[model samples]
Target chain A: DLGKKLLEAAWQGQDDEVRILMANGADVNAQDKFGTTPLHLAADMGHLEIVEVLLKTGADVNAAATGHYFQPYFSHSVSYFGETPLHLAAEMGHLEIVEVLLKAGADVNAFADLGHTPLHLAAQWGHLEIVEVLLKHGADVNAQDKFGKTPFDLAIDNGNEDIAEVLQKA
Target chain B: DLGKKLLEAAWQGQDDEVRILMANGADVNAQDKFGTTPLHLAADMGHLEIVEVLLKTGADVNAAATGHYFQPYFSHSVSYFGETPLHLAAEMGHLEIVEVLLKAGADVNAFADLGHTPLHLAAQWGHLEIVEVLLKHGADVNAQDKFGKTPFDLAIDNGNEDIAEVLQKAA
Candidate 1:
């Protein structure tokens, strides 16, 4: 419960509350029922400062949330069975959080439940800057997800020609 | 400059910065490079209080940005050219922001660049509550975009039968 509270605080961008909870011995890696951690919440919400605090408190950068069932109608074939903090940050275009996670030893090519890597997410969402950052950090340019699509394929499909060009060169 | 700062602050959910920018005479209706206004950013981000402040600052509730572009690859035929704050709220499933925008005189039946109305966005995105709110606000149920699809058409196509049923009743 304390962990959930810490997650909620991080999610809300309550930097002070997050610090207080961590100081009070809250489980930095604690997961809620959905297996979502404070790191996931902070990253997904684009709270860069909170993400930094969580990582500094030794939160698992590659921790994955399990049992997430909601899928957009268009991507029903792709299942997000598990999603890491990197996945959330990339999908949401949070470049600073992505940098922090990578610097803290996050698995650059870690796959989600649907087999999507952080590069796939950034490319798909038209986050060209994030895509560049991911590539510079040694992400596999040609990594295929469960759907057999590479980050380049997603970038092309999403009409992000700039990102597509970057991927093509890679 | 102040207007751009205000837009950035609103986009980042910095309510205090929004207020300060507004106090310093920032143009609440100023648009960014994407032609998105502060109200659009607040609505898209589901910032209810920021929406309130922008509205109170006399933001144009029905302001629509022109020359915006984003094509859904599956529906490349459809082009999103212009979008109002209401459209962003509906697309993001921000019910309270939708309600606030409507009350602030947003055109419920306003069409985006692709001819998709706020109702179409809510239905297509499976935001049933927003669909209900838009319907209650008298959005045109049978209104078709350039693609000749109404909100009902989109609801059924998206496999959202509940939204389809609601649109059916409205029609």
Candidate 2:
């Protein structure tokens, strides 16, 4: 419930309430079913001020929430579609949040349950700017997903000639 | 079981037994659980003599023999690893067999399950003579497999510097 309140505040950009809740002893790292902390929500919603506040309160940038099931002993990490907050940020083209998360040591090349990197997601969705940013940061241009599809393959699948050309050149 | 006997005979180059079995009402194109016929076994074992006998008796050159549960489906005319009998012949540097299969109307550039053509397998296996023969017959050098691997990739993977050098120059 308290975690829900934090997520709601972060999602709604209620920075003042977030601060009060934190001051009243809310867990900075509390996560929901998807492993989304208040900071993850804030970043997802582009609440820059709330993100800064939550980050200053020591929320983990690399925290992975479960997708649906909770099994630590399982071979692979499970969550909704096996995506991390970084993946969401990359797919949404949140360059600023992406920059923050990567700077905070988030794995840029981390694969989801489907073995898709942020670069793969960006390319699949034709996020040219995000694609550029990720490539500039050393994403493997030819890195494949679980289906053995590279970012180039994703580009080809989507018929994004412009992005494909850029990725080919990259 | 009957298919097994036929396959074993073909593998051992028992041409007389194969012909006898066929003459006694055995199916020329009978397949096993994986759809592998006696012809498939003979080709995979590189028994060129048996392969010739089976082909003359009319084996389907493009019979699909693997299943989805496996890594990928290989043709009966091919190897378990997706190389066709044609591919195996080329890989073993059997120019005569290669020419025979080619003359029998085998798709010279047919792809394995992983998209590797016979030329790719031949190059990878350091069969330089086969490579030249394939090239003379118009094999595609730049063909990419499922993983975008080319004949060059195969040669590189096999560490055949001579083949790799030939591939590089050919490309």
Candidate 3:
């Protein structure tokens, strides 16, 4: 129940409630049925201090929430590879959260669904500043997605010229 | 379109409708989106004439429908391995359909999801006549299911003393 409470507090952006829950022996790394952690909710919602408290309290930075898609029309059977908090932060253009996640031992090259990295995500969403930050932390510009298209290709397709140039020259 | 039509006719147990569709070039092997064949529905609905018609027209005796279930509580990815028409017939107590299927060369020992064969299914559903027929056809008396449950063990668990005695003496 405390784990569920922490998950809710983190998702609701209730910074004070998160602190109280964490202080009162609530497991920081506890997950819901979906295996979604407090840090995942905090980083995805752009709650910077909540993320800080979670990171400080031993939440795994690289934990990923899973997804599955299937249809009777030549079913896919895609499994287990899912978006992490950094994936959400980059795709949502959360510049500060991206920096915090990357610095907190979040894997720069960690792939989500479709094998797209956080750099691929930031590039496709036209987050030029976040793209630069990822590059400084050694994000792979040439990493291909499930389609074998790199971050540069994604940026170019999305009309993100500035982000494309940043990756192209890197 | 004719494939869908055959599926509907078979499911509706309209023997004449299914025969007309088959004669007019409906695929005897037609499966819907879920891979449910006409024979599958025929056997499942205890449509004896439909099963005979489909079998006579070269319908496969052992085609299986697939199912998948998953939950993210620590994440488990279950793959596809579902029940065949024979499995359906035996569990649903369609003795005549089971007779037709086994005569049509359906695999009596064919395992469905959880590795349970037609014999195991017959035992669980208390279909004692089908269970006897399966045993008479040399269905493995000691064949272990996914959980290593023999046919006798299953019959015993279900409190079906007669079926358990049948499997027990045979074993």
Candidate 4:
């Protein structure tokens, strides 16, 4: 069956409705525009129940479109610039979301086309809490991007001297 | 007549031979390859006497040959890099030759294809004295070559720390 009921239940965060629809043979992991599935929307908005329900119903979290296939959608992934869902979550200072994505197999130190990892963004944006979490997950401090700039370099460029100093000593 | 005698005399640094050839109707300004007269060779080799003789005979020091006019014999005078005889003299730290060439109307800051001036080479090769003389003669310090590399930048790239320091301080 088409994923209309599953989409509606996922969009509204109706766990009971989602269970009934799945019981009646609704596709739990129905994708919409730009190759995003129900789990993608739920994870993007930090809906833990819907994410868990979709994951349990065999919804692929890391499914990329035609050419991109690195990580899951809810993993804070971006197509351009090599940013993962974890990078986006970390950049937004969403620590719980980042932790969930990481636990679900998101790469901590994945370099984008610009040579920046999520740690670089977190440091540049002065997200100190996310910076600590990323470092604890083994984010690289000295990784250079295409411009030979490191996370420390980004911090300095953005004038975040605290993170800059921390990354330098890292 | 041709510049055969002047070329020989210029190559040997014989002022007497040069004078005799000039008197006997030899074209002192006669260019061999790439329109480079005996004057260019003499200036490039630091042959002051030959340069003087050629200068007196109305030789053009800044003559540069482009396209097919450039012959193999004049290849060293103006390389694919667009260096003139003056550039070579400057690169070799020949302040005296550079001064003479300048007095004889050589362009002090003429850039080659990539915009490298005579001062750029002088600084790059650690010819500090030559660079000072060129600067005194009104050479532009900020001339950027084709690659956007100035004399200061070239000096830094080539590890001529002293020249770079001097240029930075001057700037």
Candidate 4: list runs displaced more than 4 Å: A1-170, B65-82, B111-114
Per-prediction TM-score of chain B?
Answer: 0.89, 0.80, 0.87, 0.79
TM-score of chain A of each: 0.90, 0.83, 0.88, 0.66
Tens digits of lDDT, candidate 3, A1-109: 6787687668656687789888988999888766678887777556789988899889899898765322111111111337688876776567898888888889988
lDDT of 2 at B92: 46
DockQ of all candidate complexes: 0.04, 0.01, 0.06, 0.00
Model 2: per-residue Cα lDDT over B32-103, one tens digit each? 665666665566444677778778888876555552110111124233344456765665456777877777
True-vs-predicted CA distance for residue B8, candidate 3, Å: 44
Candidate 2 has an lDDT of 0.67
**Residue A56 C-alpha lDDT in model 4:** 77
Better of 2 and 4 by lDDT: 2
Give all TM-scores, in the order shown. 0.54, 0.45, 0.47, 0.43
Please list all clashing residue pairs in model 3, or write none if there are none.
Answer: none
Q: Is candidate 1 or candidate 2 better by DockQ?
A: 1
Better of 2 and 3 by lDDT: 3
Residue-level lDDT of model 3, residues B107-160, one tens digit each, is 877556655788987886578889989888989888887677888887887566
> What's the distance in Å from true for residue B63, model 3?
49
What lDDT does each candidate get? Answer: 0.77, 0.67, 0.76, 0.64
lDDT of 4: 0.64
Candidate 3 stretches with Cα past 4 Å from truth are: A69-81, B1-171
Clashes of each: 2, 5, 0, 11
**Candidate 4 on B42-110: residue-level lDDT in tens?**
655456777766777788777653212101111123234545667766765567888888887788775
Scanning candidate 3 chain A in windows of ten residues, the lowest lDDT window is A70-79
